[PDB]
Amino acid sequence: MKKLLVANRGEIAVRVFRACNELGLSTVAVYAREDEYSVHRFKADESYLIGQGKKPIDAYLDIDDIIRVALESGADAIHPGYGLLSENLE
């Protein structure tokens, strides 16, 4: 495991990046347009727009687009965080 994507935002995304960083993992963050000024976006080693054109909450729920990013980024893992997709089976 070299790299991790947090399928979330804000405090908990930053929480995880920290944990990652301490375990020598590279980080990847995802962000809606509406959230473009969120701290968590810039606290990661690299960050990628998602949900383009959608409503902002829908974007953090766009399962496919997240994984698209997870893959084009090179991520070995995904941390879901809490709320959003973290409890979602699909």
């Binding site: 301490e22 000024y37 969120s38 701290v39 810039f42 080693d45 690299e46 960050s47 990628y48 980024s73």
Partner: protein
């Protein structure tokens, strides 16, 4: 330690005490490491670099350090050159937003649309590049010889914008369409994308490394042969380098992505081309030996550069083991009749493909290429339409339609090209300041033979000496001077020689007679002397003898290859010497850039240190800074981007400083910049 706080010299230095804590001391370390790395304190230097090293160290992490551990560990004081890209960019943006860009009126920044991305219809094809890589240079020559169509080289990334926008085309604009070229126009023989003025101008004026340009394009255009113009003796420079340098340049260039080396010499003097040709061969690459065209073969009164001259030279060049013969018509003097006779007779004379290069200054470029394609020319040089015409190359899109139903077609995906030309149409608008103004066909070039660059630079020189009003007489003198010196091949840098001389003569009110009479009591321009000392090599048919003595005087004339006389050069000596001057270990390409253009390479490094990778800015930004309330995103890596809003521009204080108020990534940022007026 807060945003805006003036750190004074009076009190101690402490900004903030950071503790970490954890069950396992190993994890207390992990957290400290994260935090130190997490901190973003801008405005003043801090000791963080030092602390990071110290917690990295195994003596510390073991819990065993002593009081002398630090003073006895020299490793702790090697600090990574810190890259603050946010900061340096904002410095640049501020500099330009207030003092404007150098050598262009400080206008206000237009709103520009996204330039048009092309709708392409792709077709998979093997490409000369593919062949070269898989089967070598001779295999490509075979591929060319077995091609029916006239094959095209795209001069859009080099000679086109050199001819039209003073070489100011920028990588950022290039990389936005590079891929579309590679996939949309596989039919191409090569893309001319390096050499010529691009090498110094990229460093000197655009503050981007030509090497960087090459690297970044080479990844984007994996199936397109990359071609460069290359001066036989001097590669991309104007000093007199020894042979080991030239070989070295070539090794590196070859390695870094260049496939096709058009090698020429300003006086078509074979000895300057010989080593370089071999060198290119030796690196497994294609070598175009080139003849420069001057005069008019169908003009019996200019017999010096008659049809025989070219045939004989072509033989000699075939003999060097060049893969391809190139005819570089610098000034667009090849009329279409002559093009048909010349390409015809050269094809009779030698078996290597002929690559023709002209300029559409006279209005006769397309018809000249047409003639030449009837006479069997293998390859021709074209620019996309939007950067074509006038003193550029003839239109790629036009030459397709010109030969459409003819015996020989042009090999190119014209639909795809027309789509790509939309992007170039748009992008060229960013370069308005460098545009040369109203351009129409001009046949006077047949009278004076100045290449497009020489004409630009002599209009400059004339205005800066207040003779801009008598430029008509200056052009006439250029013609007289050329004849006075025995009728010579005028390309860079022999073109400047005639240039400088014709200015000097007008400026000081002397005719041809006046030179032959009172030459000894006159100091002729440096260039003119170097030429006649043989520092440029040996002109066709040698110099006029009386005039040589007069111009040279006491000085030491050579008559062999100036590279033999070149100050011997050591790569280790210079590499070490440079490492000290820039403060890191330079790659082989930096070394060689330094050898080629020493001053310019160092100035480029100051600019880099002060301003960063300006390369990454959109061109309107790069040239005009920002507008109040404007927002921009600058991509720096994949997934890292600087969002930059500008919110206010302060009035200046008494020291002539202003404070610009940006939001970079959701942080206020105050930036002080010297207003210079």
């Amino acid at each position: 330690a807060y945003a805006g706080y003036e750190v004074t010299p009076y009190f101690d230095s402490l900004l903030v005490k950071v503790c970490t804590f954890a069950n396992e001391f190993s994890d207390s370390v992990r957290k400290m490491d994260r935090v130190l790395h997490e901190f973003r304190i801008r405005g003043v230097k801090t000791n963080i670099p030092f602390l990071i090293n110290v917690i990295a160290n195994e003596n510390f992490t073991s819990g065993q350090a002593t009081t002398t551990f630090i003073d006895n560990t020299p490793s702790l004081f090697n600090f990574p050159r810190l890259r603050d890209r946010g900061t340096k960019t904002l410095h640049y943006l501020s500099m330009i937003t207030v003092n404007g860009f150098p050598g262009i009126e400080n206008t206000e920044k237009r709103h520009f649309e996204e330039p048009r991305q092309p709708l392409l219809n792709l077709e998979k094809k093997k490409t000369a590049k593919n062949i070269l890589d898989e089967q070598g240079a001779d295999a490509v020559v075979d591929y060319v010889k077995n091609t029916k169509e006239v094959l095209l080289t795209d001069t859009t990334l080099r000679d086109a914008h050199q001819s039209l926008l003073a070489t100011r085309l920028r990588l950022q604009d290039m990389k936005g369409i590079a891929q579309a070229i590679d996939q949309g126009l596989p039919e191409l023989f090569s893309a001319e994308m390096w050499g010529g003025a691009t090498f110094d101008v990229a460093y000197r004026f655009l503050n981007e490394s030509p090497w960087y340009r090459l690297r970044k394009l080479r990844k984007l255009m994996p199936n397109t042969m990359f071609q460069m113009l290359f001066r036989g003796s001097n590669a991309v420079g104007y000093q007199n380098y020894p042979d080991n340098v030239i070989e070295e340049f070539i090794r590196v260039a070859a390695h870094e992505g260049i496939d096709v080396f058009r090698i020429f010499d300003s006086l078509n003097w074979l000895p300057q081309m010989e080593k370089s040709i071999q060198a290119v061969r030796d690196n497994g690459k294609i070598a175009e030996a080139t003849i420069c065209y001057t005069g008019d073969i169908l003009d019996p009164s200019r017999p010096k550069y008659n049809i025989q001259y070219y045939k004989d030279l072509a033989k000699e060049l075939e003999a060097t083991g060049a893969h391809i013969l190139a005819v570089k018509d610098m000034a667009g003097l090849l009329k279409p009749q002559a093009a048909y006779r010349l390409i015809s007779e050269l094809k009779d004379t030698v078996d290597l493909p002929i690559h023709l290069h002209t300029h559409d200054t006279s209005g006769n470029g397309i018809i000249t290429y047409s003639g030449a394609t009837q006479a069997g020319v293998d390859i021709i040089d074209v620019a996309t339409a939007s950067l074509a015409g006038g003193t550029s190359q003839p239109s790629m899109q036009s030459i397709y339609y010109a030969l459409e139903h003819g015996p020989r077609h042009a090999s190119i995906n014209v639909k795809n090209a027309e789509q790509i030309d939309h992007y170039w149409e748009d992008v060229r608008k960013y370069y308005a300041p460098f545009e040369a103004g109203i351009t129409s066909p001009q046949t006077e070039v047949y009278m004076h033979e100045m290449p497009g660059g020489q004409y630009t630079n002599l209009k400059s020189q004339a205005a800066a000496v207040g003779l801009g009003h008598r430029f008509d007489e200056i052009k006439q003198m250029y013609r007289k001077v050329n004849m006075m010196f025995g009728d010579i091949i005028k390309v860079t840098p022999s073109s400047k020689v005639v240039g400088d001389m014709a200015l000097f003569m007008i400026q000081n009110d002397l005719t041809e007679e006046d030179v032959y009479a009172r030459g000894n009591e006159l100091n002729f321009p440096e260039s003119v002397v170097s030429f006649f000392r043989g520092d440029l090599g040996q002109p066709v048919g040698g110099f006029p003898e009386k005039l040589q003595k007069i111009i040279v005087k006491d000085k030491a004339v050579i008559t062999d290859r100036p590279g033999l006389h070149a100050e011997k050069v050591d790569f280790e000596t210079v590499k070490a010497d440079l490492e000290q001057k820039i403060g890191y270990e330079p790659g082989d390409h930096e070394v060689i850039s330094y050898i080629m253009y020493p001053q310019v390479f160092l100035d480029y490094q100051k600019m880099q240190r002060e301003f960063g990778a300006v390369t990454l800015l959109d061109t309107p930004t790069f040239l005009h800074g920002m507008r109040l309330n404007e927002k921009i995103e600058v991509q720096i890596e994949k997934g890292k981007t600087l969002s930059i809003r500008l919110d206010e521009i302060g009035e200046p204080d008494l020291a002539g400083n202003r404070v610009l108020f940006f939001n970079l990534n959701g942080q206020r940022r105050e930036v002080v910049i010297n207003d210079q007026s």
